[PDB]
């Protein structure tokens, strides 16, 4: 099972008890966005990230009482329709907000049980996706498909390194294609133990298909009532991209000289086939609309991997 998180008197994570860290309930988020939780019926804001005043530009104490109906008049009905009770926690709804202080904010919402998790990130105000889609489909084999995919992602994102990381039947990883800036170590062809991506991350990654660490040296921001008032229990954050990353993985990234990391799951037949895995040497917050393009490419790659492996076999 899982050990309690640290803020509930749980043990420190070591190389011996990796697979057991409750990565989904860290009680904190990354500092390039803000997170609120709220009651699914009343719209009452229950928890907030201690940095919410920066993004929402509103006295920090004003928000805990207010309802979403007050804070977000136009969006609160849509949220109710888009995320009905009993929907999966993988279902997400997104909108762009015109906030008085912070300008354009991207808003991403999902539902876990009776709680709505709301994520706020800055955002901006063409044919590369369509051109990439046709390029992927005309790749003649799996090897060429892998190369086109990593090159395409690098061109869209500017990431210093983009890898296609494939799991073996025992969850050993292999870098089968790589696009990278000149002057980086090549990881192409190298193989890595299964425990570098432990079983509970792999399970989580089969259900929520995008995760990132925008800055491998930034401190996490705690959620208000670390615990959910509804349940007096930790708030599930595995579907929040803003969720804090495991410190173990953050140490691993720093030792690799990586300032920013992002991966997208490739899921084939209900199983985690591999990852589009990205590195940047410096910190790098990919804006939400560009992340959506990678999310689309993830689905397209999942389709094309099946198509291609049906030709191989």
Ligand X SMILES: C=CC1=C(C)/C(=C/C2=[NH+]C(=C\c3[nH]c(/C=C4\NC(=O)[C@@H](C)\C4=C/C)c(C)c3CCC(=O)O)/C(CCC(=O)O)=C2C)NC1=O
Binding site for its own copies (CB under 8 A): 82, 87-88, 90-96, 126-127, 129-131, 133-135, 137-138, 269-270, 292, 295-296, 299-300, 302-303, 306-307, 310
Q: x/- contact string, 122-141, with ligand X (CB under 6 A)?
A: --------------------
Task: Report if residue 216 touches ligand X, rule: CB under 6 A.
Answer: no
The secondary element (H helix, E strand) that includes residue 251 is helix 247-255
Q: CA quadruple 173, 179, 183, 188: dihedral positive or negative?
A: positive
Determine contact, residues 309/143, Cβ cutoff 8 Å.
Answer: no
Smallest distance from its own copies to CB 302, Å: 6
Choice between 258 and 272, CB closer to its own copies: 272
278 is in an annotated binding site: no
Task: Report if residue 249 touches ligand X, rule: CB under 6 A.
Answer: yes
Which of ligand X, its own copies, none binds 245 (CB below 5-8 Å, type-dependent)? ligand X
C-alpha–C-alpha distance, residues 122 and 52, integer Å: 13
> Helix, strand or coil for residue 126?
coil
Which residue in 27, 198, 234, 236 binds ligand X (CB under 6 A)?
Answer: 198
Which of ligand X, its own copies, none binds 272 (CB below 5-8 Å, type-dependent)? none
Choice between 75 and 92, CB closer to ligand X: 92
Retrieve residue 63's tokens.
């928000």
Choice between 62 and 87, CB closer to its own copies: 87
CA distances from 60 to 71, 105, 132, 181, 255 (A): 13, 18, 44, 43, 37
Determine contact, residues 142/173, Cβ cutoff 8 Å.
Answer: no
Which of ligand X, its own copies, none binds 15 (CB below 5-8 Å, type-dependent)? ligand X
232 burial (CB, 10 Å; 0-12 / 13-18 / 19+) is exposed
> Helix, strand or coil for residue 313?
coil
Q: Using the rule CB under 6 A, give the single segment among 57-65, 229-237, 241-249, 281-289 that binds ligand X.
A: 241-249
**Gyration radius of the chain over CA positions:** 20
The footprint of ligand X (CB under 6 A) covers: 15, 18, 21, 23, 173, 187, 192, 195-198, 201, 211, 213, 245-246, 248-249, 252, 261, 263, 275, 277
């Amino acid at each position: 099972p899982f050990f309690p998180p640290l803020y509930l008197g749980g043990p420190e994570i070591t190389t011996e008890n990796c697979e057991r860290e409750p990565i989904h309930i860290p009680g904190s988020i990354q500092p390039h966005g803000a997170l609120l939780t709220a009651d699914g019926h009343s719209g009452e804001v229950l928890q907030m990230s201690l940095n919410a005043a920066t993004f929402l530009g509103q006295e920090p104490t004003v928000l805990r009482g207010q309802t979403l109906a007050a804070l977000l008049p136009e969006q609160w009905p849509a949220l109710q329709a888009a995320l009905p009770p009993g929907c999966p926690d993988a279902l997400q709804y997104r909108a762009t907000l015109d906030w008085p202080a912070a300008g354009h904010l991207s808003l991403t919402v999902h539902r876990v049980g009776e709680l709505l998790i709301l994520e706020f990130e800055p955002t901006e105000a063409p044919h590369a996706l369509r051109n990439a889609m046709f390029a992927l489909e005309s790749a003649p084999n799996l090897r060429a498909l892998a190369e086109v995919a990593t090159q395409t992602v690098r061109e869209l994102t500017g990431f210093d390194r983009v890898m296609l990381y494939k799991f073996a039947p025992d969850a050993t990883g292999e870098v089968i294609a790589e696009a990278r800036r000149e002057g980086l170590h090549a990881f192409l062809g190298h193989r890595f133990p299964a425990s570098d991506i432990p079983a509970q991350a792999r399970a989580l990654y089969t259900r929520h298909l995008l995760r990132l660490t925008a800055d491998t040296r930034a401190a996490a921001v705690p959620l208000d009532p670390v615990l959910n008032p509804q349940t007096n229990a930790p708030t599930p954050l595995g579907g929040a991209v803003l969720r804090a990353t495991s410190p173990m993985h953050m140490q691993y990234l720093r030792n690799m000289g990586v300032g920013s990391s992002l991966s997208v799951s490739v899921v084939v037949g209900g199983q985690l086939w591999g990852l589009i895995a990205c590195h940047h040497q410096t910190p790098y917050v990919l804006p939400p609309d560009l992340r959506t393009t990678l999310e689309y490419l993830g689905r397209l790659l999942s389709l094309q991997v099946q198509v291609k492996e049906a030709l191989e076999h």
